[PDB]
Amino acid sequence: SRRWFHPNITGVEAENLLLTRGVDGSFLARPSKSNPGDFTLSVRRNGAVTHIKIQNTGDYYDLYGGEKFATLAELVQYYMEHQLKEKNGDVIELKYPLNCADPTSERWFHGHLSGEAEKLLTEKGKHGSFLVRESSHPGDFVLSVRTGSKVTHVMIRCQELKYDVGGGERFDSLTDLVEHYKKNPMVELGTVLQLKQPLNTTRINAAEIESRVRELSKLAKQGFWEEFETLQQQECKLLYSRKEGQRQENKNKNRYKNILPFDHTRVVLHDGPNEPVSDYINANIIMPEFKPKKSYIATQGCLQNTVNDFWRMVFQENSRVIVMTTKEVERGKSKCVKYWPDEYALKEYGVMRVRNVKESAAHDYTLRELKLSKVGQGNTERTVWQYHFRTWPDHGVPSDPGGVLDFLEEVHHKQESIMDAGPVVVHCSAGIGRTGTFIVIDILIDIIREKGVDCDIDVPKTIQMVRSQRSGMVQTEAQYRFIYMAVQHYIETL
Numbered sequence: 001s002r003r004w005f006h007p008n009i010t011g012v013e014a015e016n017l018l019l020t021r022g023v024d025g026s027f028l029a030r031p032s033k034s035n036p037g038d039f040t041l042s043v044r045r046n047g048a049v050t051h052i053k054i055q056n057t058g059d060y061y062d063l064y065g066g067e068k069f070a071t072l073a074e075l076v077q078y079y080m081e082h083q084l085k086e087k088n089g090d091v092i093e094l095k096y097p098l099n100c101a102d103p104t105s106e107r108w109f110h111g112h113l114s115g116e117a118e119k120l121l122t123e124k125g126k127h128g129s130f131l132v133r134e135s136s137h138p139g140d141f142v143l144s145v146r147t148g149s150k151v152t153h154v155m156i157r158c159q160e161l162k163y164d165v166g167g168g169e170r171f172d173s174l175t176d177l178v179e180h181y182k183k184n185p186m187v188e189l190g191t192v193l194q195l196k197q198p199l200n201t202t203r204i205n206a207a208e209i210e211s212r213v214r215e216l217s218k219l220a221k222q223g224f225w226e227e228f229e230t231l232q233q234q235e236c237k238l239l240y241s242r243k244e245g246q247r248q249e250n251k252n253k254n255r256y257k258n259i260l261p262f263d264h265t266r267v268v269l270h271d272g273p274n275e276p277v278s279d280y281i282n283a284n285i286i287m288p289e290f291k292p293k294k295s296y297i298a299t300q301g302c303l304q305n306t307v308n309d310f311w312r313m314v315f316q317e318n319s320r321v322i323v324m325t326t327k328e329v330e331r332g333k334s335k336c337v338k339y340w341p342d343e344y345a346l347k348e349y350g351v352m353r354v355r356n357v358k359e360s361a362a363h364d365y366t367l368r369e370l371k372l373s374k375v376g377q378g379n380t381e382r383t384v385w386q387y388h389f390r391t392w393p394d395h396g397v398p399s400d401p402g403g404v405l406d407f408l409e410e411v412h413h414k415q416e417s418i419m420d421a422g423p424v425v426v427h428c429s430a431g432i433g434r435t436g437t438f439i440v441i442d443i444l445i446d447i448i449r450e451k452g453v454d455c456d457i458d459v460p461k462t463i464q465m466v467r468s469q470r471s472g473m474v475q476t477e478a479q480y481r482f483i484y485m486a487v488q489h490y491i492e493t494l
């Protein structure tokens with residue numbers, strides 16, 4: 001559950017909700033009104049409400065008086081299972097989620113839609129496809145389901161802010177009603193009104209990207225914000241185990257203590273014997289449909305103590321291309337240590353040897369031609385091409401996708417020219433925001449390469465697929481919009 005997130009409330013409403021309907025330990029999270037792009041954690045403690053700022057410029061969720069997180073659900077899960085402190089040092093306990101009744105971030109809620117609903121279910125629906133729309137009985141709602149084939153409309157009465165389908169139980173929210181009739185389906189002459197999946201509205205034909213971008217650009221905040229927040233609501237389905245990253249011997253191998261690789265997709269390092277735990281790196285394999293040559297490794301920026309493990313990973317996975325999307329230093333803070341030798345220099349990083357053959361400077365990036373081999377084994381040498389994108393802004397995203405697209409095209413062609421190359425290594429600082437953005441753009445553009453402009457692309461479906469393989473891949477609404485703009489610009493220059 002992610003019912004503790006309220007997408008459309010002010011600080012005043014949040015305070016009033018917690019003081020009248022919550023108790024000490026009650027909490028909620030919400031988008032900031034004073035600074036769009038930020039979030040607020042509002043917590044009831046000692047009969048008063050505290051508002052804690054959460055910032056995200058594209059790399060992670062940074063909680064004031066707390067730690068850095070990959071998603072708001074991982075943030076909430078951490079503090080609900082653990083500590084959060086005020087400026088004066090006092091402990092703030094997250095005990096009771098204060099649940100939201102707003103249906104605006106539900107995949108199935110369409111708001112204003114005529115009984116249009118039938119046209120959408122006929123064209124895109126299948127057996128069990130459903131949606132909820134506003135009724136004409138103003139203030140009431142309509143549940144429209146496809147079964148097969150036919151479309152059935154069930155009236156939803158709203159009486160005293162409770163919802164019902166004519167009889168039986170009265171629900172506190174449309175969400176509660178939908179969940180109930182999803183578990184216990186309504187039965188008609190025998191037709192079972194099974195609610196199998198919400199009607200898909202995000203899958204578009206690539207050719208019509210400009211049209212969808214125009215529609216998403218309109219005020220709902222824009223349609224992009226509403227689509228992104230519906231994707232964010234589904235992050236609670238991705239709380240997979242990250243036990244290996246939490247182990248004592250692995251703690252200092254993480255750039256950010258709470259930003260960890262899922263156990264089920266982490267890169268396991270073999271051939272480590274004097275080191276009790278030599279199999280860990282903060283990296284995950286990312287597959288585009290969840291071949292190694294069409295796959296990626298999403299990882300963090302090297303720490304001084306993880307450089308050797310990084311080169312063990314590249315060697316083992318037979319990776320021939322590295323995509324670096326951060327400077328070594330940004331805003332005076334180290335984002336990635338220099339894990340490569342100076343031009344023309346040779347270095348040993350543990351058992352691995354690396355030669356920097358040549359560097360080539362381009363407008364937005366530097367290419368470093370590297371020769372990687374295992375010490376004592378001449379025949380193991382392979383070229384590793386490091387594409388270092390150097391112009392990404394300190395906060396937010398580039399104003400134009402052109403530069404990223406040109407860079408991505410070059411990376412793709414290098415990778416495609418190498419027979420049986422392993423996955424493309426992609427990293428930034430935490431390895432989830434800019435890394436996830438580059439990877440998602442690359443996946444979507446590759447569909448267009450192979451299939452052409454008439455192919456189907458579904459941006460949040462692709463993101464959700466990438467997010468099931470590494471926490472919080474694609475961090476912000478700005479990156480979300482940037483992915484759409486990059487796909488639009490790619491289709492436009494075809």
Ligand SMILES: C[C@@H]1CN(c2ncc(-c3cccc(Cl)c3Cl)c(N)n2)C[C@H](C)N1
Nearest residue numbers: 107109110226227230231234460461464
């Ligand atoms: C009628 C609703 C539809 N909607 C929406 N529908 C599905 C996804 C999505 C797709 C594929 C995978 C995942 Cl996880 C998701 Cl949430 C998404 N982002 N938005 C936007 C909302 C403002 N209005």
